[PDB]
Amino acid sequence: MGSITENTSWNKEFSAEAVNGVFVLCKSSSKSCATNDLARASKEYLPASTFKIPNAIIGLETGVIKNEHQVFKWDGKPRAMKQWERDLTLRGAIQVSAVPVFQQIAREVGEVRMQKYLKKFSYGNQNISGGIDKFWLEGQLRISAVNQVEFLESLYLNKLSASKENQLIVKEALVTEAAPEYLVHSKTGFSGVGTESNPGVAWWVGWVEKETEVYFFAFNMDIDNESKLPLRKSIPTKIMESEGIIG
Ligand SMILES: *C(=O)N1C[C@H](NOS(=O)(=O)O)CC[C@H]1C(N)=O
Ligand code: NA
Ligand code: NA
Ligand code: NA
Numbered sequence: 001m002g003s004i005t006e007n008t009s010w011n012k013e014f015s016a017e018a019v020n021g022v023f024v025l026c027k028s029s030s031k032s033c034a035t036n037d038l039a040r041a042s043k044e045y046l047p048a049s050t051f052k053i054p055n056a057i058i059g060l061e062t063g064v065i066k067n068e069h070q071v072f073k074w075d076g077k078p079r080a081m082k083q084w085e086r087d088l089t090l091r092g093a094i095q096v097s098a099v100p101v102f103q104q105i106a107r108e109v110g111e112v113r114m115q116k117y118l119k120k121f122s123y124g125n126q127n128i129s130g131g132i133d134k135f136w137l138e139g140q141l142r143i144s145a146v147n148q149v150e151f152l153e154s155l156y157l158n159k160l161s162a163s164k165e166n167q168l169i170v171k172e173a174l175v176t177e178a179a180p181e182y183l184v185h186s187k188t189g190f191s192g193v194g195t196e197s198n199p200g201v202a203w204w205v206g207w208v209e210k211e212t213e214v215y216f217f218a219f220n221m222d223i224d225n226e227s228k229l230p231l232r233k234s235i236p237t238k239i240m241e242s243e244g245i246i247g
């Protein structure tokens with residue numbers, strides 16, 4: 001990362017909702033970032049479903065995902081969300097956030113190759129302890145909002161230690177809004193409601209391409225009640241709108 005400046009006026013959008021969280025927003029052309037909370041911007045949290053981004057790249061790199069058009073077939077047995085009970089493409093599995101597809105990717109990648117690529121990607125604390133299929137869900141892996149924006153900038157630039165083709169495949173799978181001069185790539189996550197005195201984490205990370213500028217973003221918040229989940233999009237959206245970053 002370049003420079004980061006704390007702007008505590010952005011806490012307005014958090015206090016209104018009694019949210020403890022952080023937003024990091026970086027403008028590519030000026031090599032500068034801003035945050036409501038410098039200390040929290042570097043604090044590391046479970047990646048939860050945001051881990052689909054590195055995991056998809058790693059699955060392609062290792063050949064476990066055979067190519068961009070692989071279909072992940074449903075075995076017909078119960079899955080935890082109805083939206084996952086179907087065959088899915090790579091983009092569909094990312095977009096509906098189908099955990100079992102990505103747990104099996106991780107199993108097939110295996111611990112040695114997973115460790116290798118998280119070290120190459122400088123991905124968080126790089127700690128894959130807790131089981132090959134769940135280290136990023138309930139194990140020891142942790143990543144900060146600063147590190148998310150660094151990782152996403154590298155992906156945007158095709159500068160991760162992976163083929164350019166595999167980075168491009170994952171990028172199209174992450175498009176969530178497309179207009180002529182406005183394109184958003186993004187991914188949500190939610191580790192759960194935590195335990196007593198130990199909240200869960202909710203995430204929204206991504207980047208916005210508006211005309212010839214690019215803005216990288218990462219939001220996280222403590223969460224202990226699922227009713228608060230939409231704040232992971234609404235608070236960053238309000239901040240980005242106040243910065244003029246909008247269709
Ligand atoms: C990822 O964090 N998970 C899978 C699924 N993601 O949907 S989200 O991106 O809208 O948060 C549901 C939540 C979570 C999980 N249960 O593991
Ligand atoms: Na920057
Ligand atoms: Na955490
Ligand atoms: Na437009």
Ligand code: NA
Pocket residue numbers: 199222223224
């Ligand atoms: Na909380």
Ligand code: NA
Pocket residue numbers: 009010012013238239242
């Ligand atoms: Na604001």
